[PDB]
Amino acid sequence: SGFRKMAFPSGKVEGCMVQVTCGTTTLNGLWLDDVVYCPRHVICTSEDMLNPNYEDLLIRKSNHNFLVQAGNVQLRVIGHSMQNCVLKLKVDTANPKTPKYKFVRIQPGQTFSVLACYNGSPSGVYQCAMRPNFTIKGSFLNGSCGSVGFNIDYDCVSFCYMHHMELPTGVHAGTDLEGNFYGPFVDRQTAQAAGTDTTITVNVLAWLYAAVINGDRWFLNRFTTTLNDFNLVAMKYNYEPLTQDHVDILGPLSAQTGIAVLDMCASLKELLQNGMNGRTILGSALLEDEFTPFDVVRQCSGVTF
């Protein structure tokens, strides 16, 4: 048993990380088949970033202005184009290590693994949630741009995130692999407002189920509630509303533990109203909302890839 924040094995993704340099700027790129994906701000100077005109900046670049290195292998760039906020660099060689993959745009509250990279070389792997305000609270240093987030299903890598920037608040923003930002953000160096962040209620409930499965039961109470009553309390504590679809998703966990979803909501409403009183749940003194229902089931079933 046990329960940890757990990343997907990163091997299939390591094999796609390459280094992309343009003029003075270097960052990471993702090489799938014969195309290298990377953030378009690779074509900017530091002074450009204050207010970039991306199509005028890209006008000035030819194919040979793009240095793409895969390990020590130099890739020949034979085409370039901009799609929203990512550059696509057509290269003359298909990545022989390309996994089966898809590009997908996740929903707020869903989780993914981040393979942090620098100069095209993997540095570490960790799990992240897309917050309700479409930021992520990661660990990215200068040069980490182009690092990607992904989920794996057996042998298929679903790429869902490419890293573009750290906001002045110190949280992180990026795009899907078609270059569309998550949230209202743009790739310009200006202060930009992320919305009010909120707690991912369905994830908290899933984590409470993980706790019961692992023996932590002190928070189980003798009350119950309704979806509407609970949602009134959810709103008061800046928690995402809970929907019927969320109840349905929590179905398998409720069947395993014998605890009906609305009975777990009554437990949570009590932890919200009375606090945790210095007690812990699965080694944490705060309510944890970065495990989805699928993450919990994965880690209490043993799915492999």
Ligand X SMILES: O=C(Cn1nnc2ccccc21)N(Cc1ccsc1)c1ccc(-c2c[nH]cn2)cc1
> Tokens 């944490």 belong to which residue?
284
Contacting a copy of itself within 96-115 (CB under 8 A): 115
165 binds, among ligand X, a copy of itself, none (CB under 5 to 8 A by kind): ligand X
Active-site residue 41, yes or no?
yes
Q: What's the CA gap between 37 and 31, in Å, rounded?
A: 6
Binding to a copy of itself by CB under 8 A, coded x per residue (else -) over 212-231, reads --xx----------------
The angle formed by the CA atoms of residues 8, 113 and 213, to the nearest 5 degrees, is 65
Dist CA 10 CA 126 (whole Å): 10
User: Smallest Cα–Cα separation from 225: which of 265, 188, 258, 191?
Assistant: 265
DSSP 148-213: EEEEEETTEEEEEEEEEEE-TTS-EEEE-TTSPBSSS--SSSS--------B-HHHHHHHHHHHHH
Helix (H, G, I), strand (E, B) or coil at 16: coil
Among 101, 118, 140, 159, binds ligand X (CB under 6 A): 140
Residue 87 CB, shortest distance to ligand X, in Å, is: 12
Active-site annotation holds for 172: no
Element (H, E) at 77: strand 77-83
> Does 118 participate in binding a copy of itself (rule CB under 8 A)?
yes
Decide: 122 and 114 in contact? Cβ < 8 Å: no
Q: Does 25 bind ligand X (CB under 6 A)?
A: yes
Residue 145 binds which of a copy of itself, ligand X, none (CB < 5-8 A, kind-dependent): ligand X
What sign results for the dihedral spanned by CA atoms 73, 74, 77, 80?
positive
Helix (H, G, I), strand (E, B) or coil at 1: coil
Chosen residue from 18, 42, 116, 212 binding a copy of itself by CB under 8 A? 116
Nearer to ligand X, 85 or 250 (CB): 85
- State the minimum distance, in angstroms, from the CB of residue 138 to a copy of itself: 5
Work out whether 40 is an interface residue with ligand X (CB under 6 A): no
Q: By CB under 8 A, which span of 67-75, 99-107, 123-131, 221-229 interacts with a copy of itself? A: 123-131
Work out the angle at residue 255's Cα, subtended by the Cα atoms of residues 216 and 296, and round it to the nearest 5 degrees.
55
Q: What is the crossing angle of helices 261-274 and 201-213, to 10°? A: 100
Task: Please select the residue that binds ligand X; options are 40, 164, 246, 269, rule is CB under 6 A.
Answer: 164
Would you say 212 and 282 are in contact if contact means Cβ atoms under 8 Å apart? no
Using the rule CB under 6 A, which residue among 73, 141, 191, 286 binds ligand X?
Answer: 141
| Binding residue (CB under 6 A) for ligand X from 19, 36, 38, 41 | 41
Task: Give the residue, chosen from 53, 62, 107, 142, that forms a contact with ligand X under the rule CB under 6 A.
Answer: 142
Position 7 contacts a copy of itself (CB under 8 A): yes
* Longest Cα separation, the chain: 69
- CB of 171 vs ligand X, minimal distance in Å: 10
Q: Which residue has the tokens 């069947």?
A: 255
Instruction: Mark the segment that binds a copy of itself (CB under 8 A) among 50-58, 77-85, 141-149, 188-196.
Output: 141-149
The residues that touch ligand X, with contacts defined as CB under 6 A, are 1, 25, 41, 44-46, 49, 140-142, 144-145, 164-166, 187-189
Catalytic residue numbers read 41, 145
Contact positions vs a copy of itself (CB under 8 A): 1-12, 14-15, 115-119, 121-126, 137-144, 166, 170-172, 214-215, 280, 283-286, 298-305
